[PDB]
Amino acid sequence: RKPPKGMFLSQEDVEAVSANATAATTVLRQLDMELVSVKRQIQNIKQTNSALKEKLDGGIEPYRLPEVIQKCNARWTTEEQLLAVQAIRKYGRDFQAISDVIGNKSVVQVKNFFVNYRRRFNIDEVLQEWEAE
Amino acid sequence: PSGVEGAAFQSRLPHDRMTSQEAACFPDIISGPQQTQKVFLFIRNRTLQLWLDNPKIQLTFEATLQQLEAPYNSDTVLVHRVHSYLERHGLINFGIYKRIKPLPTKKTGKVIIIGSGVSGLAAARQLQSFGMDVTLLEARDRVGGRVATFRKGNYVADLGAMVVTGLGGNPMAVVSKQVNMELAKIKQKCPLYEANGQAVPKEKDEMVEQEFNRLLEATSYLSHQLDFNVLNNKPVSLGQALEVVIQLQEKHVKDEQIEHWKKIVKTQEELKELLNKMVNLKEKIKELHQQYKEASEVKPPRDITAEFLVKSKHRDLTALCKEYDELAETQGKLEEKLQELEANPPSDVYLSSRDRQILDWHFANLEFANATPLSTLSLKHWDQDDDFEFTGSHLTVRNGYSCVPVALAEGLDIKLNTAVRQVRYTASGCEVIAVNTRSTSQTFIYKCDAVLCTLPLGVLKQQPPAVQFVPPLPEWKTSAVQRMGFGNLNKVVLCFDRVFWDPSVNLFGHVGSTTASRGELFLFWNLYKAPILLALVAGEAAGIMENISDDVIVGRCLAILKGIFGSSAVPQPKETVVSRWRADPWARGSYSYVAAGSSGNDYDLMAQPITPGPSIPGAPQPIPRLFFAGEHTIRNYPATVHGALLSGLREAGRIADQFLGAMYTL
Known part of the structure; x- marks a missing residue:
């Protein structure tokens, strides 16, 4: 009454892949193409993020001020x-x-x-x- | 099981309930007190036991009564009824037994039996057993039918039925005590050897086999849970349903990959907006620093607003410096999720091309089991006979399975080389018209009270007809004939001088190059003691290899064998035989299968007798004259020898009930 472990079979899926003679080949191609669509969008936000990372060479090391270690007085000068x-x-x-x-x-x-x-x-x-x- | 209850199991009967057959013969007992039912049931079971514990001699009623004890042996007629029922319907005293009581000298009634296959022989013996005159007509020059055995020298190899599929409840068990059958167990281990000539590694053999089995359960899920049994007005086949299940597993793999990379982009866009927020902070910081050191270069002493500026810029710079540090922690985290996500990508493919080829062999095996391409099998019903599988190891017959029909044929009137060609049945009797297969002009007439047809379903399917029915079979019979499937399977026998294979391996596979050729010589058998390798041709390959010469077919097996064992270890075979069962006109196939669009009810339809119309209009309705048996007629055990045999036993009990009367139903 439940499909075997590892197998993925719902009602919704099945007419989608039987609805015509090559509805299977078409459905697999859309996923196959949409998979390149996203791999390049990764390369391209790798590139964007790789440049932004280089602008941050050294962070803010030269712009830091030492720590003021100051005991907290009570009177107001x-x-x-x-x-x-x-x-x-x-x-x-x-x-x-x-x-x-x-x-x-x-x-x-x-x-x-x-x-x-x-x-x-x-x-x-x-x-x-x-x-x- | 053990004791009387074990006898009920060995007879394929429940020990604790009465069957529909018995309710018909003992409607007094089933409708009556539950106590008498248990009496009957014990009487049945204990008689079955007696027969079973020694089936080489007839079990007479007196003999049954003596072993029966009180209070079970009180009602002497209950015991006479029970024994007579079991005898009639072949549950006892069937097969090859010695008689105590010799045959009554005068026979009553005449039956013509078409075909001396097992189903034919089994009825013929029962009918003779019952005091009828029986003659069998056989097109071939031999008994046995689709039990064929090759014999040349000490070479022995079945071209037809070869395996006893387990003795738990199998009537062939009884036959094996009656005939010298050398029953040798089957070592189920089978090494797959791919098209190169080298084993499939136990890693891969096991997980493909496990996917195969999972793909099967999946089709069953499609069938029984999602009612996926009709597509575009046509019933769904098993092969279709397998494709659908494979596609949806290929679709799921692609879907998993997308959802994985899609949560990479989501997290590398959080990273993108984190970096932008960190450029735009490192620039504020590079700038406030400048403002702070300028406000410090103003040397003291300074007025409070100059002092405030240095302090204010210092506070602001340390503030912005804390933000940029918090962001760096956040960048490090997200920079680590990308490393782990990249390191944990999901499966690239569902099955590789090498993997699908192994899967192809497990389909070829299943096409062999059902003697047909999986695109013809009914998805819903193709396995409807699994719930009556016998228990125990499958076995082979080392001295040749023909030993069984020949044994049964002893003592029977068998006309060989006699091809039945027309069947005439009327209200007053029957005439069968046959010819001699050698000179077809010479013509024969047989007249009888009843005809028992055991023509193979493939013969009944032949268009134009090889056998003409007069009058024509009714629509309901002919339509069952078209709906049913009649498959094909072929065997190649290869005879050698020297075992040049692993002798503790009974069987080993060869993986084909294509889906198309998945069944071409995909499995090899050494079961015989002698140097005999036997090669199968299943699925779509079977039908096509029949149009190829034996030398080419033997050539391909040698090449396959050469790759698995080396080009030097394979000697030319001495004797070669190649079956071509679809081409044989006395078979026109190998055995039945539940075609898509068929069901098990068609097997019952095939078993119905035919009753002709009244000769004179207004005459009383006549007796059935045309009866059918054979493997295509036994719903719960089709396409097996035990099934054919049981169907013979069935009709002989039914014909006798009609022409000799049932005196045990009162």
Whole structure:
């Protein structure tokens, strides 16, 4: 009641291959041709990808900056406040980026910083200016 | 099986149920209490046993009663009925037995039997056994029919039936105790040797053979599960269905290849878009770097917006540098799936040209089994007789299978060289008109109560008729005759002085070059003790080799043999014989096959007797006068010797029932 293992026989298949005198030869040819269709499309995306790979010779090895190993302070120098504001007009709410700019401030004090200096540094206005960009 | 139950199996009867035949003769018992049924059944089985455990002497009723025990031997008439039924229908006291009770001096009734093949002989003996006058007419100068045996010196080789297909339930078993048949087992191992002259490696022999068998199951699936039995108003053949199954396996291989390479392109286009995203990132990075080192070349001390620029560009560069690293990890992965996918491609082909040629030999073998091209076999029904296969090893007959008909022919009135040429049957009797095969002018008239026709189906098929029926056979009989298949098979006998082959190899194959010539000399037999190799010609080759001279045919076998064994080991054969069964006019073929468009019901149609019209209009309906037997008439055992024999036994019991009466049905 089930075909033998390895054999592939469904209803749908069979009229397709019996429907005329050479419907078998035709059906095998379409698969045979569509098989070249795809082999060349492989050669051709091998070639495309082979060129793109050569443009990436050496990756980004010459463009890497050493690692800043910096212990995270708690006090805000007048300097670090000023980097902060500028980071906000350039980054908006991405606290991870902002901390990376200041360097020695973690994301939480960065959050605390927005609320703490909200009126003296017009943090609200700065975000509006960042929003229109 | 063992005991009385074993006897039922050896008689092809269920031990625990009564058959349709017995229900007809004992309608009292089958319709009655289940207890009496078991009584009967035991009585049957134990009588069968007695006959079977010694079949060289007649089993008289008294003798059966003595061995029978109570309470089974109480009802003396039940035992007389049972014994008489078995005797009539040839389940006991058939073959070549010595009589206790000598024949009644006066015979009753006259029967003419056309043909002294096995089916003819087996009826003739039964009818004589029953007290009738029997005469057989035989076109040939010999008995046996399609049991032919070559004899010259100590060379012995069957041109016809040669194998006893297993003794489990085979009536030839009984015959083998009655005749000196040297029954030699068959070593089933067969080395294939391809057209070069060298073995097919056991790697390849086994997986082609396994594909062959799988291709068969597949056609059966097509037949029974998907009802693929009619195409363009014509019934589907087996060969067609095999092509369809092969194509769909060739189609599947191509389909697998496409889905494989298609998931390569899918993943090498992910790679393409990954690389583009990595060019366009390496350029941002090459640029922000420039911007960063420019903003660093501004030496300190600098105002906070200058300081912010250096820090901002540094943060952005390390960000873009992290993205490009994540992409490199992703590129490495996908770059590895392409390596594995390329390394794991699916099968290139379904079957190679060398592989299909081996497959071709397994088809030639199957064409030999059925004596016909697989395009003629009915897909639905070609194997309808497998469920009655006998158990046990197949055997050959080392002293020649003709030993059997000749044995049966002993004591019978047989007119040889007598070609029946017209059969006349009427409400009052029959006349058979035959001529002498040597001088066809000399003419004979035989008159009888009944004719038993065992003309081979090929003869009945002949147009214009070789035998004329008067009146003509009814449409339902003639149409069965056209529908049925009558195949062809031929053998070449090669006689040698010296075994120059592997003597522990009974049979070995030769693989043909083409599909077309797949059956030409594709199998070789050494079964005989002496130096005799025997070569088969099956399928479409059979019909065509008959138009080729024996010297050319022997030539091709020598060439095939020379390649498998070397050009020096093959001596010229002394005696050569080549059968041409389709050309023989007393056969016109080898044996029947279930043609596409036929079925097993046609074999039953062939077995029906013919009843002529009333001589005087308004006279009462007459008795059947024309009866048929032979291998083409036994649905469950066609195209075999045991089948012909059983069909003879069948009609002799039926003719006797009609002309002598059945007194055991009360």
